[PDB]
């Protein structure tokens, strides 16, 4: 980062933002992850048991990435609009 003594880039620009502790305990789940759990019910515990999310994750969201081709029940997670459409079309259901 030294630039010969001119105020270097990483000091002539300003700092911004803050780091969110809640982001560190939130995770995202792909559609292709849904079939990887054991039992056909997707929740925080079954994702952790299948090693899809970390042990200290408290919140997770399923997103439209990859495909789901089997009926699954999602319980206690947030689901995007596209992911909800894909899950229901594959034959599953979403329970709050």
């Amino acid at each position: 980062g030294f630039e010969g003594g001119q105020m270097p880039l990483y000091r002539r620009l300003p700092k911004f933002g803050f780091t969110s502790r809640k982001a560190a305990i939130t995770a995202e789940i792909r559609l292709s992850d849904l079939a990887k759990v054991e039992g056909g019910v997707v929740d925080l515990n079954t994702l952790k048991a299948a090693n899809i999310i970390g042990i200290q994750i408290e919140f997770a969201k399923v997103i439209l990435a990859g495909e789901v081709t089997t009926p699954v029940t999602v319980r206690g997670l947030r689901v995007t609009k596209g992911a909800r459409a894909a899950i229901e079309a594959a034959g599953g259901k979403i329970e709050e």
């Binding site: 980062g1 990483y10 000091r11 620009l13 300003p14 700092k15 933002g17």
Partner: peptide
């Protein structure tokens, strides 16, 4: 890490 740069670039 240069912590000062981490505070200013993403």
């Amino acid at each position: 890490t240069v912590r000062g740069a981490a505070k200013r670039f993403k």
